[PDB]
Enzyme design. Sequence first.
Site, PDB file in Angstrom:
ATOM      1  N   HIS A  62       0.821  -1.212   0.000  1.00  0.00           N
ATOM      2  CA  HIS A  62       0.000   0.000   0.000  1.00  0.00           C
ATOM      3  C   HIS A  62       0.871   1.286   0.000  1.00  0.00           C
ATOM      4  O   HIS A  62       0.359   2.376  -0.334  1.00  0.00           O
ATOM      5  CB  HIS A  62      -0.966   0.090   1.147  1.00  0.00           C
ATOM      6  CG  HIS A  62      -0.408  -0.200   2.499  1.00  0.00           C
ATOM      7  ND1 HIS A  62      -0.402  -1.475   3.056  1.00  0.00           N
ATOM      8  CD2 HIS A  62       0.075   0.625   3.452  1.00  0.00           C
ATOM      9  CE1 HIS A  62       0.084  -1.419   4.282  1.00  0.00           C
ATOM     10  NE2 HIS A  62       0.375  -0.151   4.552  1.00  0.00           N
ATOM     11  N   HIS A  92       6.832   7.003   5.452  1.00  0.00           N
ATOM     12  CA  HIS A  92       6.308   6.602   4.172  1.00  0.00           C
ATOM     13  C   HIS A  92       5.618   7.787   3.555  1.00  0.00           C
ATOM     14  O   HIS A  92       5.445   8.826   4.218  1.00  0.00           O
ATOM     15  CB  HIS A  92       5.298   5.431   4.328  1.00  0.00           C
ATOM     16  CG  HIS A  92       4.112   5.809   5.171  1.00  0.00           C
ATOM     17  ND1 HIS A  92       4.114   5.644   6.533  1.00  0.00           N
ATOM     18  CD2 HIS A  92       2.960   6.465   4.864  1.00  0.00           C
ATOM     19  CE1 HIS A  92       2.957   6.108   7.039  1.00  0.00           C
ATOM     20  NE2 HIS A  92       2.261   6.669   6.051  1.00  0.00           N
ATOM     21  N   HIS A  94       2.266   9.234   0.715  1.00  0.00           N
ATOM     22  CA  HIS A  94       1.038   8.948  -0.045  1.00  0.00           C
ATOM     23  C   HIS A  94       1.140   9.896  -1.275  1.00  0.00           C
ATOM     24  O   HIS A  94       1.645  11.030  -1.116  1.00  0.00           O
ATOM     25  CB  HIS A  94      -0.161   9.425   0.788  1.00  0.00           C
ATOM     26  CG  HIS A  94      -0.285   8.671   2.069  1.00  0.00           C
ATOM     27  ND1 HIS A  94      -1.004   7.496   2.145  1.00  0.00           N
ATOM     28  CD2 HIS A  94       0.317   8.837   3.283  1.00  0.00           C
ATOM     29  CE1 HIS A  94      -0.914   7.007   3.378  1.00  0.00           C
ATOM     30  NE2 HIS A  94      -0.081   7.769   4.071  1.00  0.00           N
ATOM     31  N   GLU A 104      -3.071  13.577   1.801  1.00  0.00           N
ATOM     32  CA  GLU A 104      -4.226  13.127   2.574  1.00  0.00           C
ATOM     33  C   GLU A 104      -4.850  14.330   3.249  1.00  0.00           C
ATOM     34  O   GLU A 104      -6.034  14.579   3.030  1.00  0.00           O
ATOM     35  CB  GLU A 104      -3.728  12.114   3.635  1.00  0.00           C
ATOM     36  CG  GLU A 104      -3.196  10.844   2.862  1.00  0.00           C
ATOM     37  CD  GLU A 104      -3.310   9.595   3.723  1.00  0.00           C
ATOM     38  OE1 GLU A 104      -2.825   9.602   4.860  1.00  0.00           O
ATOM     39  OE2 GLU A 104      -4.000   8.642   3.286  1.00  0.00           O
ATOM     40  N   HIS A 117       4.723  11.045   5.898  1.00  0.00           N
ATOM     41  CA  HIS A 117       4.322  10.806   7.295  1.00  0.00           C
ATOM     42  C   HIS A 117       5.503  10.161   8.005  1.00  0.00           C
ATOM     43  O   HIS A 117       5.972   9.079   7.554  1.00  0.00           O
ATOM     44  CB  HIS A 117       3.189   9.770   7.295  1.00  0.00           C
ATOM     45  CG  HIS A 117       1.871  10.384   6.858  1.00  0.00           C
ATOM     46  ND1 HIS A 117       0.778   9.643   6.429  1.00  0.00           N
ATOM     47  CD2 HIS A 117       1.525  11.697   6.727  1.00  0.00           C
ATOM     48  CE1 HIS A 117      -0.199  10.509   6.077  1.00  0.00           C
ATOM     49  NE2 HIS A 117       0.234  11.752   6.251  1.00  0.00           N
ATOM     50  N   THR A 196      -4.256   6.542   8.985  1.00  0.00           N
ATOM     51  CA  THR A 196      -5.137   6.756   7.803  1.00  0.00           C
ATOM     52  C   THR A 196      -5.206   5.520   6.954  1.00  0.00           C
ATOM     53  O   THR A 196      -5.834   5.534   5.876  1.00  0.00           O
ATOM     54  CB  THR A 196      -4.583   7.947   6.993  1.00  0.00           C
ATOM     55  OG1 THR A 196      -3.335   7.602   6.427  1.00  0.00           O
ATOM     56  CG2 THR A 196      -4.560   9.241   7.786  1.00  0.00           C
TER      57      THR A 196
HETATM   58 NA    NA Z   1       2.242  -0.082   7.892  1.00  0.00          NA
HETATM   59 ZN   LIG Z   2       0.552   7.715   6.004  1.00  0.00          ZN
END
Ligand code: NA
Ligand SMILES: [Zn+2]
Length: 258
Positions: A62, A92, A94, A104, A117, A196
């Site tokens: 993800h 990581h 997004h 986000e 994040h 999230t």
């Molecule tokens: Na994770």
């Molecule tokens: Zn995140």
Amino acid sequence: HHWGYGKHNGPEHWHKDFPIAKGERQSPVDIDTHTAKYDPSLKPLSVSYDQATSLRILNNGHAFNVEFDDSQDKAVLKGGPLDGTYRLIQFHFHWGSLDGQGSEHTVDKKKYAAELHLVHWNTKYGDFGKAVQQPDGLAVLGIFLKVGSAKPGLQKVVDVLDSIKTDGKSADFTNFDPRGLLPESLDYWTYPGSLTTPPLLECVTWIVLKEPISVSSEQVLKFRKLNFNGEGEPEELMVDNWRPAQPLKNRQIKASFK
Ligand code: NA
Ligand SMILES: [Zn+2]
């Protein structure tokens, strides 16, 4: 995992397996800058990342996480709205399929190209797994990315993405200094929120920095070449791995600045 970001398993479905998705303190949210309350009692953030030990970068299907050794107080966050010392465990991002979406959090409904994040946990709870069960267990620093000039300190991350293209791939990733990802100013908004992604637990003090960092179009292009899928499965590009803004409900966003 079954959940994801597609039509049939994406964020509007998550509540069936994770009923906390419709909870009272979900993230992310839109930060309405004119309704955020300046709070003169908030202290400056203290980011101590000079002793950070990165270990590994991995694709978990993800996002990709860069993971840090958190067995001692080596990279910690203190101050701001926090009590106690929070240790860095991973970071990581997004990001979007296009430059006009990907973050986000939004700021007066403005979306950024991506959002970083940095995830830290409260050392009073002893390990990350206990910390996520507590209302003050995690502190996540969120930093927006806009597309403009390259960020030199991000390049080492972009250069290794080739080796962790599919879900479950990992690579050694040592001596990465996360100080190269921080903006000049540490002014911030803060509110109580959640993870999230599933399990969406409501254990996060969010600290979202006001000043974005800039990355180049070629840098974010390379994030868009990763895959959600595992090796030898049909190719699905890892893009738009962001959850849309959730209702603020009974919460106040505070600002450290005016
Ligand atoms: Na994770
Ligand atoms: Zn995140």
